[PDB]
Each structure stands twice: as C-alpha cells, then as structure tokens.
Structure 1
Amino acid sequence: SHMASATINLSAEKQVIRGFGGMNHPVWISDLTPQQRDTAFGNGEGQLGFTILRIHVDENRNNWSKEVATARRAIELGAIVSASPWNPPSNMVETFTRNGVPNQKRLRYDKYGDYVQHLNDFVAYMKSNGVDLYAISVQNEPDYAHEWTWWTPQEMLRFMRDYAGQIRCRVMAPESFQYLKNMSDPILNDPQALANLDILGAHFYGTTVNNMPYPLFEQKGAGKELWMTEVYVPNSDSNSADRWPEALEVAHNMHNALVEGNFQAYVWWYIRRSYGPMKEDGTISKRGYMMAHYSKFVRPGYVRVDATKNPTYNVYLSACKNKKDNSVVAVVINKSTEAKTINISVPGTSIRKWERYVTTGSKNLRKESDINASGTTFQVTLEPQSVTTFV
C-alpha cells in the first residue's frame, strides 16, 4: 500500500568487485601522513576501508621515491595500487596545434618505445621498493589534456596495438575524462590492442547515467577489468565535504557506477582534501561516509548481483554477494524527504538477520536495530535523506 518491493537475485551474478579508494599525489599536494594512511586503508571503526590506491607516474624519475611510503603502507593494509601518468618526460614530448589552440603537448611518434621503457622503469622501481603495481595506465585523461599530454583515439590505438604488449604490468587505458567511448572503441575493436589491454579505466566527470552502460565492452571485454579511476562529485567546492544533503550525490554516483556501469572499482580524486572523503584534519567527511557505505562492507572479491535498482522514486538499491558463504551486502539510498519502507525479497537465502548502519545529516554509520526476515523477505525502513548498508 505505502510499501515498495525489491528482489535481490543471488543467482544472477554481475561484476566482481575489485574495490574502492582514491588518489595520493605527494608532489602536487602533501602526502598522506602515517595516521591518514591507516584511516584510509584500514577497515576498523572510523576508517574508510579503501582497497585501491591510485598514484601518479612522475615525468621526473627523481620524484618517484615520494610515492613509496604511502603505496607500501596501502599494500600492507590489503590494498592494490594503480599508477597513472599525466606527461611523459619532456624530452619525449612535442608541441602541436589542436582545434586552433597552439602549444599543445603530445608524445612524439618516434618516442613510443622510449615511453614504454619509462613506464617499465617506474614499474621496476616500485617493485624494487615493495610496491608491486596492479596496473599502470597509458595516460590520464588523454582527451582533456589542455594542461597535460593529449592522445587522439588513433594515437592511443597505435600505442595499445604496437607498444603496450611490452609493458611489464597490467595495462590500463584510456582514462577518458567523461568515459567517452570514442577513446576506447578503437581498442576494443582491434584484436591486438584488446589483447594488450587489461583494464578499461574511465573517469566520470559529467558522465550521465545514460552514458554509463557500454555495450561494446559487454560484447568484447571478456577477461578485462572495468574501473572508474577518478572523479569528485558533485563539485570540488572548497570546504564542501560535509554539505548535506549534497553529499548524497556521492552515494548516488557510486550506486550508478556499480549498477548502471557495471564498474568493478570506484576511485575518488584526492583522498585528503576539503571536498574529499578525508578532511584536512584527518577525519572522515560526509562525502567519505558515503564512500564508506560501500567500501567498508563490499569487499574485494564480492560479486554484484541483480537487484531491483530503483524500487520507488528517490530510492536506489545495490546488492553484492560474498561467495564464501552466500551472504549479501545491500546498500540502499533514500534521497526522499519522506521515509520509505521496502519489502526486499531474497529468494533462496538462508540468512534471516541483517545488521544495518545508517548515515544522515546528523549521524554517521550509526548502527541501528537489526532486521529479522519473515521467510526470505526483509522489510526495511529508510529514514528520510539517508544511506543504509545492510550486512
């Protein structure tokens, strides 16, 4: 009557979750402190439970040592590390005019081999320092490189087809600023380039929900991972990270990445920033608690399953299964100003009790009363303007 229904189908397995996290950049900003590394990558009370660290590949190898402390610590705490370059070493770059704008940067065509060696050198250096990179990217935002190095779709294709097989690591590409398919379609449509791809990386700046599905990747991307490797939402406004109900957009963007995009990873920009998941004082922001609803509970290796995604207006549901014991983690967002009651059917489960943690404008991951199932149905109530994780 006033009650919507949802079904979680534990037998309809979607993508395996790789993880959640954010960026460290100890050259552009201050490195994470030891305390901040634990807060980010630990999963104790008051910690974010991140499992992915993104770092940059500096054009100047003399900066590489600055990455090590944080990356080692992340790995020790159970995270994986991916690395993205913004520019090649300046001796490999040339200028050109793009769309009438002069003095734009690209990798010299005669330096693609030397660029592979630069990337391989970084991989080797980090490995020598106890940082076995999960992946390394060809280029950060090759299609939004006003302030860095541009690659056209065909330049990226040439590198992926003719060079990237020499990289001694998983290769990530193309990290389009907005997941523009023109950057990635040529890779997926060329068998050698596709063979040399390991992770399709994408950013989400201005990416609408209708542009989150990718039919070509569904068709040709078997064995390749799909990662959303950078965003901040809904803005990078100074001191915005505790704004409420604005922060609910973070949860909604993550729900969309997972359910509308089938993404296996979701990685914020700077971990510690006034608009990020960790505030400058080292404590978790409202935006951070939005991330934590997923990161603390949907651990690497869980598998997303089919679940009614939008059971009623302003309510969004995702579900992931732990294949070790077929338990489920459900993250449910209520953006409504009204409370919502959902009958969530989980056919075939032997689970009969969920614990729940709730964030609103006035509390953070507050543990609330357990939900006891009637048979295989869990009736939940969602406070106005809230996110709840059921576990």
Structure 2
Amino acid sequence: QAGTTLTVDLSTTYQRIDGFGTSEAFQRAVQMSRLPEEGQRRALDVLFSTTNGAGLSILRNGIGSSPDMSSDHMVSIAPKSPGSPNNPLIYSWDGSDNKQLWVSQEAVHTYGVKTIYADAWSAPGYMKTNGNDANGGTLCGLSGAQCASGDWRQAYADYLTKYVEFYQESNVTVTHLGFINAPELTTSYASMRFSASQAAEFIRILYPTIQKSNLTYKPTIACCDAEGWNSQAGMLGALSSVNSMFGLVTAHAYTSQPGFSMNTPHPVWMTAAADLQGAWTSAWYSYGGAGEGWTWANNVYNAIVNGNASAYLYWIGAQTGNTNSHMVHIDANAGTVEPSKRLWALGQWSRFVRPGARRVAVSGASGSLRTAAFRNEDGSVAVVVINSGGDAAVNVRLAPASAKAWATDNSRAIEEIQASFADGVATVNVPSRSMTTVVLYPA
C-alpha cells in the first residue's frame, strides 16, 4: 500500500522487438531536404537521435515506380521501358532516390540506425498488365497475368536487386526488401495487385535472384504490406510453402487493427498507421481523439501486446501540411520543424525498447495502469506504464543496481522524472495521463 508494485517476471518471454520507425516516401524526404540546415538537422535529430529525439530505429523507404517526380510521385531507377523484358533494364540513377538516400545515410551513419526496409508499391508501368505504375494491375508473367509485352517477373527481381545494389554502392545496407504494398487495393497512385499465391510465386523468383547477386548483405524478403492484420492473415496459407525464402511479415493498421497474433513463424511488423483523415493536432491528451499522442502511445501498446508486433512504424515522420498523416510538422514558410506528441509517443517507446529487446511478463497493472516490460540486449529492463488516472505512486522491481525514468504527457516530451532506488526497487510518481518508462539497470 506504499504505492502499486509492478513485478517483472523475466522467466516468461514473448516476442522480440526489432524497433520503431517511419517513412519519408512520396517526396516527404524532399520536403525535409528543402529546409534550412538548422531545420534539416532538427528534423533528423527529432526522428533518430537517442539523446534529443525519438531514437527511431527503423526507416522504411519506397522503391519508386513512377516515370518522374510529378505531384508527390517517387521516380524509378528505371523509368523508361527497354521494350522487351529480354533487353537489359535501362538504369538512370539520380544519386538521390527521391531524397530518401540522404535520410538513410543520416539515419545509418549519423544516428546508428541498422534497419532499412525498402518496399516497392508497384513495379514500373512497363512491367504490368495495365502499363502504368498507378491504378493497380499486376506484374506481367505471374499465373493469370499474361501481357502482350511478355514475362517481366525475372526483370522485376533484377530491378529490386539493382535498387539494393545502388544503396550498397552509396554506403547504405538495405536489410529488408518488399515488392508489393497493399496488394489487395487499387488506387490512383502507385499500386499493384497480387494474390497471396502470386506473392509466393514471385518470392520463389526473387529469393535465388538475391542469393546469386553481388550484394554484400542479402536482404530479408518481406510480405505483403496488406492494409490490415485481417487481410495479411488471409495471405499466410499460400505464403507457407515459401517460409524458407522470406523472413518478415508486414501489415498496416488501416482496414483492421493489429489485435491478434498472426499464425506465421516470422517476426511481424506493423509498417504503417496514421490518423490520415484528421486535421493537424499536436497535443498529448485532451479526450483520446484519433490524433492525440496518448492515443498513439496506446495504439503501439495494442499492436505489441495484442497484435504480437515486433516493430511499429507510423506512416510519415516529417512533412508539410495540416493533417495527422505525419508525426513532425514542417512549416516551409518559417523554415521550422515542430514535433507533435505523436512523435514523442513513438519515442517514449523507441528510446528505451531498443532493437533485440525481448518482451517479458509484468504483473500489478489495473483499471488505471496498462503495463508492459522489455529486456534489452544490454540487460536493462524497460517497464512501460500508461496511466489513465491521477498521479500514481508505483514501485518497479524484478521477481538491478540503479534506475531512471522518463515520461511523456501534456507538459513533458520524454523528460526524466525521479526514480528513487533502494535494494533493487525503483519508486516513481507516474504522472497523470502519461506514458512513463521506468528502466532498471543491471550491476
């Protein structure tokens, strides 16, 4: 009764955490590149810094499919048809990749990010049944997708391998590689329709292409960036024959929520979520609205604890405009960068739950407290406390030599709070309507 005691049971383990992150696809990287130098550095710091930012540990890039950079389109490394799929692809590398190469180089070389996930939303138009990287259509040569122009399946595998090679030659290792996005959805923008059976057919072609290549690191193939857990779970049966040839399951949080554990041997990443419809809000908590930082801290909780996610990526990091599609507002007029409390929600996770952490059991939670715990590779134990009540006296212990704690709330952005430590037990005052992380350090 001297506070509520949370007890971590290290002997009960769950999934590994690969990390937390976002994207700068569809020219959002270009928006960041336009800022003055101080704004560029502030945007990169708030995304990736483990000292003064969210410490995001994963970057997701788009493999551009478009003929040019009209609108927000991502130009392809091979934007012009070679006529026949038997002819060498025509590579036209611009040394930029829609400004994503720069963001990647900063993430890796400046901030120590080690996980780079490159995903194509479509093949180039000349490889597809409709001849266009937009408006759906399918990769020519897959079962049920004949094209007058012939079979482009091996050409698409060669093209994806070459994109990874261009990154390698620019000193960035792509670690994970996707070849579809929302394969169940036709849209006005870059989109491509594959069945689950077609995804397995293509993995059988892509895997040996990667393995035979001159790539120094062979990236892990991912599938399939469906728009929700329910749609992705429907694809896993057909994928199971190629489980030896890919190593990551990906899905978003749009058409359904990440609320159950999918039946796959692979780690599962939630690779895109956002309040796409909402006008810009910056607040941590007011009433649990769809754009509030509090809401997003709880969305991450749900994906990890209920959805068995090993990673969580918000859709976009920094971009211009007054929607909640992003975490960090760019004001091009002012040359300024202003994080929302959605950035700090994701960072309140990512700063303390580092890649390779193992989720472990913690008991003592309640109506007012939701808790989760993570054992980092360095032996630190991060205990997440999401508090929907008033200030709460909490003790945190293992069933350690020191402790620290940080909170995010309406007044704090991952700000240190007192963690009073005696004989292995941390005592904190978890602020009202906060997400607090208490970290127990080993001797």
Q: 2:312 aligns to what?
A: 266
Q: Aligned pair 1:369/2:418, yes or no? A: yes
TM-score, normalising length: structure 1: 0.85
Find the aligned partners of 1:93 and 1:43 in 2 and give their Cα distance: 42
Find the aligned partners of 2:4 and 2:340 in 1 and give their Cα distance: 31
83, 87, 112: which one pairs with 2:118? 83
Q: 1:172 aligns to what?
A: 222
Q: Is the 8 A contact 1:22 1:269 kept in 2?
A: yes
Q: Is the 8 A contact 1:205 1:231 kept in 2?
A: yes
Displacement after TM superposition at 1:26 (Å): 5.6
Find the aligned partners of 2:5 and 2:226 in 1 and give their Cα distance: 37
Question: Closer, same or farther in 2 for the Cα pair 1:94/1:28, shift >3 Å?
Answer: farther
1:10-38: per-residue Cα shift (whole Å, max 9, x none)?
23333222211110126366343441223
Q: Aligned pair 1:229/2:229, yes or no? A: no
Report SS of the residue matched to 1:65.
coil
1:313-354: per-residue Cα shift (whole Å, max 9, x none)?
242112111243x32111211123x3444444421xx34x42
Report SS of the residue matched to 2:152.
helix
Matches within 5 A, 1:75-154: 75-76=108-109, 77-79=111-113, 80-95=115-130, 104-108=136-140, 109=142, 110-147=151-188, 148-154=191-197
Find the aligned partners of 1:377 and 1:243 in 2 and give their Cα distance: 29
Q: 1:69 aligns to what?
A: 102
Q: 2:70 aligns to what?
A: none
Q: 1:311 aligns to what?
A: 365
Q: 1:99 aligns to what?
A: none
Q: Aligned pair 1:185/2:236, yes or no? A: yes
Can you give the 5+ residue segments of structure 1 that lack an aligned partner in the other structure?
97-102
Find the aligned partners of 2:164 and 2:234 in 1 and give their Cα distance: 24
Q: Is the 8 A contact 1:152 1:183 kept in 2?
A: no
Q: Is the 8 A contact 2:22 2:315 kept in 1?
A: yes
Q: 2:45 aligns to what?
A: 38
1:260-302: per-residue Cα shift (whole Å, max 9, x none)?
2232221111101352222213232211111111111212222
300, 321, 329: which one pairs with 1:279? 329
Find the aligned partners of 2:177 and 2:48 in 1 and give their Cα distance: 20
Question: Closer, same or farther in 2 for the Cα pair 1:360/1:116, shift >3 Å?
Answer: same
Structure 1, 1-10 or 235-244: larger mean CA deviation:
1-10
Q: Is the 8 A contact 1:344 1:377 kept in 2?
A: yes
Structure 1, 82-91 or 179-188: larger mean CA deviation:
179-188
256, 275, 280: which one pairs with 1:207? 256
Q: 1:321 aligns to what?
A: 375
Find the aligned partners of 1:184 and 1:164 in 2 and give their Cα distance: 18
Question: Closer, same or farther in 2 for the Cα pair 1:198/1:150, shift >3 Å?
Answer: same
1:133-182: per-residue Cα shift (whole Å, max 9, x none)?
01110211112333411112222222224544423521011111112244
Displacement after TM superposition at 1:357 (Å): 1.4
Q: Is the 8 A contact 2:370 2:386 kept in 1?
A: yes
Displacement after TM superposition at 1:372 (Å): 2.2
TM-score, normalising length: structure 2: 0.76
Find the aligned partners of 2:384 and 2:342 in 1 and give their Cα distance: 15
Find the aligned partners of 1:166 and 1:12 in 2 and give their Cα distance: 40
1:177-236: per-residue Cα shift (whole Å, max 9, x none)?
11224443124532xx11111111121225335x3312x22xxx1xx3322211114x54
Q: Is the 8 A contact 1:58 1:64 kept in 2?
A: no
User: Structure 1: which amino acid aligns with 2:245?
Assistant: N
Q: Aligned pair 1:330/2:363, yes or no? A: no
Find the aligned partners of 2:416 and 2:206 in 1 and give their Cα distance: 51
User: Structure 1: which amino acid aligns with 2:267?
Assistant: E
Find the aligned partners of 1:64 and 1:82 in 2 and give their Cα distance: 18
Can you give the 5+ residue segments of structure 2 that lack an aligned partner in the other structure?
34-39, 66-75, 78-91, 143-150, 211-217, 287-291, 331-335
Structure 1 moving runs of 4+ over 6 Å: none
Find the aligned partners of 1:320 and 1:363 in 2 and give their Cα distance: 23
Displacement after TM superposition at 1:120 (Å): 1.0
Displacement after TM superposition at 1:113 (Å): 1.6
Question: Closer, same or farther in 2 for the Cα pair 1:371/1:145, shift >3 Å?
Answer: farther
Q: 1:18 aligns to what?
A: 18
Displacement after TM superposition at 1:244 (Å): 2.6
50, 59, 75: which one pairs with 1:53? 59
Report SS of the residue matched to 2:138.
strand
User: Structure 1: which amino acid aligns with 2:251?
Assistant: A
Find the aligned partners of 2:183 and 2:239 in 1 and give their Cα distance: 17
Find the aligned partners of 1:334 and 1:188 in 2 and give their Cα distance: 40
Report SS of the residue matched to 2:337.
coil
